[PDB]
């Protein structure tokens, strides 16, 4: 997971007002990755390898 | 001769209730009401005078 944002909630308001507003809530994101592979191959000649 | 010409009837005393439908955390609204009535008794136990 990752917390992208927290958002804004609440504000200072005039006392005479009798209600309040809705803010803009934050955002959360789901992320994922991957794993990679390394490979190779090599070959020999038996007699040459044995006599070297 | 009142107490027989006219009667007065009461049912419940005044009551006050708070209203959650419009009572924010920063405001209040109150409701109240009461009931009563009356009905003429004997028609012969009183007279009225008028100009003519």
mmCIF file of C-alpha atoms in Angstrom:
data_model
loop_
_atom_site.group_PDB
_atom_site.id
_atom_site.type_symbol
_atom_site.label_atom_id
_atom_site.label_comp_id
_atom_site.label_asym_id
_atom_site.label_seq_id
_atom_site.Cartn_x
_atom_site.Cartn_y
_atom_site.Cartn_z
ATOM 1 C CA UNK A 1 0.000 0.000 0.000
ATOM 2 C CA UNK A 2 0.851 3.696 -0.152
ATOM 3 C CA UNK A 3 -0.779 6.766 1.413
ATOM 4 C CA UNK A 4 -0.869 9.243 -1.463
ATOM 5 C CA UNK A 5 -2.588 12.044 0.465
ATOM 6 C CA UNK A 6 -4.274 12.955 3.744
ATOM 7 C CA UNK A 7 -6.808 15.503 2.482
ATOM 8 C CA UNK A 8 -8.230 18.587 4.161
ATOM 9 C CA UNK A 9 -10.838 18.267 6.914
ATOM 10 C CA UNK A 10 -12.510 21.046 8.867
ATOM 11 C CA UNK A 11 -11.912 24.793 8.929
ATOM 12 C CA UNK A 12 -12.413 27.877 11.062
ATOM 13 C CA UNK A 13 -15.975 29.138 10.609
ATOM 14 C CA UNK A 14 -18.039 32.110 11.723
ATOM 15 C CA UNK A 15 -19.756 31.414 15.035
ATOM 16 C CA UNK A 16 -23.171 32.581 13.806
ATOM 17 C CA UNK A 17 -23.403 29.751 11.256
ATOM 18 C CA UNK A 18 -25.300 26.667 12.413
ATOM 19 C CA UNK A 19 -23.713 23.930 10.267
ATOM 20 C CA UNK A 20 -20.450 22.806 8.669
ATOM 21 C CA UNK A 21 -19.149 21.619 5.310
ATOM 22 C CA UNK A 22 -17.633 18.450 3.893
ATOM 23 C CA UNK A 23 -13.940 18.510 3.062
ATOM 24 C CA UNK A 24 -11.974 16.579 0.468
ATOM 25 C CA UNK A 25 -10.821 13.271 2.013
ATOM 26 C CA UNK A 26 -7.457 11.718 1.306
ATOM 27 C CA UNK A 27 -6.394 9.019 -1.121
ATOM 28 C CA UNK A 28 -4.845 5.569 -0.702
ATOM 29 C CA UNK A 29 -3.261 3.568 -3.517
ATOM 30 C CA UNK A 30 -2.453 -0.097 -4.100
ATOM 31 C CA UNK A 31 0.850 -0.893 -5.812
ATOM 32 C CA UNK A 32 2.668 -4.070 -6.819
ATOM 33 C CA UNK A 33 6.020 -5.080 -8.258
ATOM 34 C CA UNK A 34 7.800 -7.892 -10.061
ATOM 35 C CA UNK A 35 10.862 -10.141 -9.849
ATOM 36 C CA UNK A 36 13.290 -10.760 -12.714
ATOM 37 C CA UNK A 37 15.392 -13.683 -13.931
ATOM 38 C CA UNK A 38 19.076 -14.079 -14.849
ATOM 39 C CA UNK A 39 20.199 -17.117 -16.845
ATOM 40 C CA UNK A 40 23.016 -18.466 -18.994
ATOM 41 C CA UNK A 41 24.623 -21.588 -20.419
ATOM 42 C CA UNK A 42 28.065 -22.771 -21.529
ATOM 43 C CA UNK A 43 29.428 -26.002 -23.006
ATOM 44 C CA UNK A 44 32.783 -27.775 -23.255
ATOM 45 C CA UNK A 45 34.513 -30.473 -25.271
ATOM 46 C CA UNK A 46 35.295 -33.418 -23.026
ATOM 47 C CA UNK A 47 38.730 -34.445 -24.312
ATOM 48 C CA UNK A 48 40.069 -30.893 -24.596
ATOM 49 C CA UNK A 49 38.801 -30.001 -21.129
ATOM 50 C CA UNK A 50 40.307 -33.195 -19.698
ATOM 51 C CA UNK A 51 43.730 -32.737 -21.325
ATOM 52 C CA UNK A 52 44.192 -28.996 -20.768
ATOM 53 C CA UNK B 1 -75.289 30.790 36.791
ATOM 54 C CA UNK B 2 -71.906 29.587 35.601
ATOM 55 C CA UNK B 3 -70.473 26.232 36.694
ATOM 56 C CA UNK B 4 -73.599 24.841 34.993
ATOM 57 C CA UNK B 5 -74.074 27.008 31.883
ATOM 58 C CA UNK B 6 -70.555 26.367 30.557
ATOM 59 C CA UNK B 7 -67.839 23.788 31.251
ATOM 60 C CA UNK B 8 -64.080 23.860 30.667
ATOM 61 C CA UNK B 9 -62.015 20.700 30.183
ATOM 62 C CA UNK B 10 -58.246 20.181 30.092
ATOM 63 C CA UNK B 11 -56.430 17.011 29.057
ATOM 64 C CA UNK B 12 -52.674 17.410 29.603
ATOM 65 C CA UNK B 13 -50.344 20.241 30.636
ATOM 66 C CA UNK B 14 -47.835 21.838 28.300
ATOM 67 C CA UNK B 15 -44.904 19.626 27.298
ATOM 68 C CA UNK B 16 -41.574 20.509 25.686
ATOM 69 C CA UNK B 17 -39.473 18.164 23.546
ATOM 70 C CA UNK B 18 -36.189 18.563 21.691
ATOM 71 C CA UNK B 19 -36.195 17.783 17.964
ATOM 72 C CA UNK B 20 -33.267 15.764 16.613
ATOM 73 C CA UNK B 21 -34.344 16.334 13.008
ATOM 74 C CA UNK B 22 -32.936 19.866 13.031
ATOM 75 C CA UNK B 23 -30.745 19.928 16.152
ATOM 76 C CA UNK B 24 -27.132 19.982 15.011
ATOM 77 C CA UNK B 25 -24.271 19.856 17.484
ATOM 78 C CA UNK B 26 -24.264 23.676 17.250
ATOM 79 C CA UNK B 27 -28.021 24.393 17.284
ATOM 80 C CA UNK B 28 -31.292 23.336 18.910
ATOM 81 C CA UNK B 29 -34.986 23.173 18.033
ATOM 82 C CA UNK B 30 -37.760 22.831 20.618
ATOM 83 C CA UNK B 31 -41.329 21.582 20.191
ATOM 84 C CA UNK B 32 -44.318 22.151 22.464
ATOM 85 C CA UNK B 33 -48.070 21.700 22.585
ATOM 86 C CA UNK B 34 -51.096 21.260 24.807
ATOM 87 C CA UNK B 35 -54.725 20.144 24.630
ATOM 88 C CA UNK B 36 -58.004 21.448 26.049
ATOM 89 C CA UNK B 37 -61.638 22.063 25.225
ATOM 90 C CA UNK B 38 -65.026 23.273 26.372
ATOM 91 C CA UNK B 39 -68.738 22.701 25.793
ATOM 92 C CA UNK B 40 -71.856 24.672 26.682
ATOM 93 C CA UNK B 41 -73.971 23.098 29.403
ATOM 94 C CA UNK B 42 -77.545 24.119 30.193
ATOM 95 C CA UNK B 43 -78.843 26.702 27.727
ATOM 96 C CA UNK B 44 -81.433 27.989 30.216
ATOM 97 C CA UNK B 45 -79.013 29.106 32.951
ATOM 98 C CA UNK B 46 -78.026 32.423 31.343
ATOM 99 C CA UNK B 47 -79.301 35.435 29.426
ATOM 100 C CA UNK B 48 -77.733 38.135 27.258
ATOM 101 C CA UNK B 49 -78.721 41.795 26.881
ATOM 102 C CA UNK B 50 -78.496 43.779 23.642
ATOM 103 C CA UNK B 51 -79.491 47.136 22.188
ATOM 104 C CA UNK B 52 -82.642 47.693 20.155
#
